[PDB]
Amino acid sequence: HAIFQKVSVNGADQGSLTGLRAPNNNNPVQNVNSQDMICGQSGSTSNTIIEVKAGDRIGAWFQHVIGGAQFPNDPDNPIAKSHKGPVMAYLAKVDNAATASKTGLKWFKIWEDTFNPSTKTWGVDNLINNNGWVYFNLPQCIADGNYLLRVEVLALHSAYSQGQAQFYQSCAQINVSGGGSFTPASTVSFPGAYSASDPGILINIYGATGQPDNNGQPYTAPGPAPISC
């Protein structure tokens, strides 16, 4: 139960919900065909378009509730330790980030922190270790102009049952400067890219004693592979 609710560019805190299309509530989206799977549920929107340069270090801040922790010593801030799973980042080219409809956009994945079989660590584990933040670099090669940056936590604690995997989502409205000439080799539709019966969505991640280690097996994240320049 968390909400990506704040961007940071090379450390520069862009402000709570500045240029964010983010849910009001922290309830999970579980129907992978739902329109809520693009930028999460409808709720907060913004008129800001975050000015970034191709290559910048984007940090995305997840917290239990809007504002941060729901109460002093909140055990589920930034997210509950049980919510093991990957975190994923997509881009989609638009004319005007502020106006653009979230529907029908051609998405492409730029980054993912999935699972490490050896160290037994998930994307969410790093999320928590980084006090809610998730850092990644915007690819150098992408072409200038407006994008929707779509960061997405996938929690797989109950994902052993069909349609019980949990998706947490939000979109930063951004604009890219000092870019290249990379158009994606292929794109994916949202909703559409994820199938409920995927190895990464329908999956039991619990080992013998019941620890969420995926029996030290390599996780296969949903959607396309991250791009490369």
Ligand SMILES: [Cu+2]
């Ligand atoms: Cu939850």
